[PDB]
Amino acid sequence: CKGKMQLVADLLLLSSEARPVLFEGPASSGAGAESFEQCRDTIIARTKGLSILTHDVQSQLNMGRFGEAGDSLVELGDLVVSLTECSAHAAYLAAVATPGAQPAQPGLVDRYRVTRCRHEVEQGCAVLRATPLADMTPQLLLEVSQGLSRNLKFLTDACALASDKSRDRFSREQFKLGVKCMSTSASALLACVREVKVAPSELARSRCALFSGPLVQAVSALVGFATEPQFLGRAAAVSAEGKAVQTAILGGAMSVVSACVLLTQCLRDLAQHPDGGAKMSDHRERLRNSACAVSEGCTLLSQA
Amino acid sequence: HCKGKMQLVADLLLLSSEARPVLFEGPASSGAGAESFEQCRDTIIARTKGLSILTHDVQSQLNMGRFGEAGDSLVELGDLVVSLTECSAHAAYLAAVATPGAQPAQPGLVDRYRVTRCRHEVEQGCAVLRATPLADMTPQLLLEVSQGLSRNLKFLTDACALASDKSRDRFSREQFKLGVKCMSTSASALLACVREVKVAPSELARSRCALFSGPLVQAVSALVGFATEPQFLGRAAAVSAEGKAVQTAILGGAMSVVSACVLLTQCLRDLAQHPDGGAKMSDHRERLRNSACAVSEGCTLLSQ
């Protein structure tokens, strides 16, 4: 049951390390219709939440309340994710607010989001593959099936929009065909997930693994097609000052993420021999690291 | 180039005729749909005659240097050997079950041999779409690939429809349908790309065709994999030792024929480098021998 904490202090780590796909590259709006000031306020809120959750998870671990610590981590991960996205967006807005800037131009789809969705679909199917039978509980399968259901819902909407925005016949129809393929694959798999749920057996499980391939491939093909170079639009064109302004904020946000990562590993570290815990300083140092990182983050938002 | 066009055939033929030996190893099942032993034997006689003819034809046509003709002769030889193989297998089954204490085979929801072949051919087609460089992707090759895939997919669809009907399980009954839907949508998605790379050739379109190949292969693999689950497979015939002997004989003879024609293919393949200076016309002549004698064995083990 303490294992359930190593789990989180890992899926969380990867969840928050994946998001640094916004911290390296060009300048694009990392969000949907918000202004810089509001965004910075959001970041402030997140950092507050971060202080709170840092303390909470710390004390909850040091109490021996692992089940709570886990959820606290989950929330911390989600919070760091949000903070990262907002940081990226604020960096972009600050960048384009600069004198001679030209704004970015949207692709047919949001690359970052669909990339995330592909990653999540692959993760879900991986979970269906790597889970042993008796461990495939009716709740786990429902969670996986629900996660696949959102991801597919988002991809479907995105590709619908992309189809609409397309002014070429082939692309317009290809998006639709790809969507149909994706949906049928999904249905086929989810049937198997329901079957292995109601009538568990090794056959049904291997079946669930069998019908995972078509969905992963479908989504990979659709996303691959959706991100063809001519569909990608354009990153913003900004002066050196803009890029500096953006680099700063991205730096701070990266500081936060890295600090929280080190904290996560430190949480995972003591989850073997807690009573002994010869490494009590390492854990405590990351509260500080995170706090200072948050300070940098706040520093580069008020100045630029 | 035109002798170049012959490596292709003297290879796809070999694999086409070596793949069909999926009827030459295993248990005893009807390898055809509703024919009697005598008629089957007659068919085999006809095939062997045709085989003698085509043996000569391809031999002389090569030794004349008329390669384009030799190629087509090979193709027809391949098709003929395939037919002979199927008939031989069926005759072996019929002879086996004609034995005193035999119990006949019982059909699975689908014909394993055919769907296996179809999966193999879909994979082959998609492989061809992947490994062909642009401009070698001629408007005829794409049409050929497309029609092949369409032919295999039509068969798979009909078979799985029948399987859905014959199913006595709700889940299986529905799963066949879902799998078919998935297969068809994937197919459509891919064939669209095949049409695009044909009308508007480019590297993008080509890589696209390769991109949209995965979902179809996986769809077919999942559907075929599911269709051949152990509880769907039915039963092989239960025959005495004499029956099995009787079958072993015929399968042996037919295997002799196939192996001989394989070696002949290789001998034809051998001389397509230095025809003017090829000391091994004897290797080539010997396979006439092997094939003829093999045909004799085949006929021998058919009379009893």
Numbering used by the authors:
A (entry chain A): 40 to 343
B (entry chain B): 39 to 342
Which text from the study accompanies this structure?
Talin rod domain–containing protein 1 (TLNRD1) shares 22% homology with the talin R7R8 rod domains, and is highly conserved throughout vertebrate evolution, although little is known about its function. Here we show that TLNRD1 is an α-helical protein structurally homologous to talin R7R8. Like talin R7R8, TLNRD1 binds F-actin, but because it forms a novel antiparallel dimer, it also bundles F-actin. Increasing TLNRD1 expression enhances filopodia formation and cell migration on 2D substrates, while TLNRD1 down-regulation has the opposite effect. Together, our results suggest that TLNRD1 has retained the diverse interactions of talin R7R8, but has developed distinct functionality as an actin-bundling protein that promotes filopodia assembly.
To determine the extent of the structural similarity between TLNRD1 and talin R7R8, we used x-ray crystallography to solve the structures of both full-length TLNRD1 (TLNRD1-FL) and the four-helix domain (TLNRD1-4H). This confirmed that TLNRD1 consists of a nine-helix module comprised of a four-helix and five-helix bundle connected via the same unusual domain linkage identified in talin R7R8, where the four-helix bundle (R8) is inserted into a loop between helices α3 and α4 of the five-helix bundle (R7). The first 40 residues of TLNRD1-FL are not visible in the density, supporting the secondary structure prediction that the N-terminal region is unstructured. The TLNRD1 structures reveal the basis for TLNRD1 dimerization, which is mediated by a novel interface on the four-helix bundle. In both the TLNRD1-FL and TLNRD1-4H structures, the four-helix bundle forms an extensive interaction with a four-helix bundle of a second TLNRD1 molecule. An identical dimer interface was observed in both the TLNRD1-FL and the TLNRD1-4H structures, which crystallized in different space groups. However, the structure of TLNRD1 revealed that the putative actin-binding surfaces on α2 and α3 are positioned facing away from the dimer interface, raising the possibility that TLNRD1 might engage two actin filaments simultaneously, and thus cross-link and bundle actin. However, a notable feature of the TLNRD1-FL structure is that the five-helix bundle packs against the side of the four-helix bundle. Thus, it is possible that this more compact conformation might represent an autoinhibited conformation of TLNRD1, rendering some binding sites cryptic. The structural information from equivalent talin complexes was used to model the RIAM- and KANK-binding sites onto the TLNRD1-FL structure.
